[PDB]
Design a protein around this ligand. Structure first.
Ligand code: ZN
Ligand code: ZN
Lengths: 173, 174
């Protein structure tokens, strides 16, 4: 599996919510059978990382008779107004042997309907939560070309995660 | 104030759910204080759904923030999810805790794939959502329509459609 540049990880997964950022998304994924496929994806030429993950599901050749858990570690929560939540809902309805967990570093409130995205994905069976220190370091250790160097947290990581988690839990309550 | 044309009422509040319709909405409203009345109707205009146009006019009603008000919507379609109506109504009710909102819908907005999420979100926000029955159609005819003394005439299957839709709604909200 090809490993991500460390600078790319840190700049995209920093969870300080008061920074204006570009609308790029990185999506680290793992699939577990209940196979083990793993990798990462970004938005490319108008196609959001979430839909690019859906595009490659056929190449994973999942057994329809087997149950799989798909985990996304994603730098932004999925949008509504550009079709991501809708395509992801359709995929879950069409592939009931798949259970999806979405762990988001930040909430994508640049979309006016971002709350509708989170709420509808929850209703479709996705488990949506905000990334914590544990997940950030796991991603550093798993998807990043770190050359044996340990994860070094950015300032306020824990406070930002708890603040965003409280906001997400209020949206979904 | 101003009364609706009868053909406009009949074509917009017909409750046959299997009819291909234009995505226009009519919303007849009543506002009363509980222990001061406003009434009117609204449709979608230039893309803005009637529900949001009602929220737009709340300031001009000059409601006392200290008093409780019951707002009743007789609305031809239940409010949508995918274009933001349910979310905007939830925000308004959270910001205006002295409003008690009752939504009586002629039809369920099946054109929205996420219509069930809208209904559940409105219930969770404190709105009482129900399906219009013969009683409500006739009340609206008697109240909001330029009927010139003519009685309400039901369309085919009115009662059957209302009970079927009511059963769907109650199952969604159980
Ligand atoms: Zn998207
Ligand atoms: Zn709407």
């Amino acid at each position: 599996r090809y490993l991500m540049d460390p600078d790319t990880f840190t700049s995209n997964f920093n969870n300080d919510p008061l920074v204006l950022r570009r609308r790029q998304t990185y999506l680290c994924y793992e699939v577990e059978r209940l196979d083990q496929h793993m990798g990462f994806l970004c938005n490319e030429s108008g196609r959001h990382a979430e839909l690019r993950f859906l595009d490659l599901v056929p190449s994973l050749q999942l057994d329809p008779a087997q149950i799989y858990r798909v985990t996304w570690f994603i730098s932004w929560s999925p949008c509504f107004s550009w079709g991501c939540a809708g395509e992801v809902r359709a995929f879950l309805q069409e592939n009931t042997h798949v259970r999806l967990r979405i762990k988001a570093a930040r909430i994508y409130d640049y979309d006016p309907l971002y709350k509708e995205a989170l709420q509808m994905l929850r209703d479709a069976g996705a488990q949506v939560s905000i990334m914590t220190y544990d997940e950030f370091e796991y991603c550093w250790d798993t998807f990043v070309y770190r050359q044996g160097c340990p994860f070094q947290p950015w300032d306020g990581l824990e406070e930002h995660s708890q603040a965003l988690s409280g906001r997400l839990r209020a949206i979904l309550q």
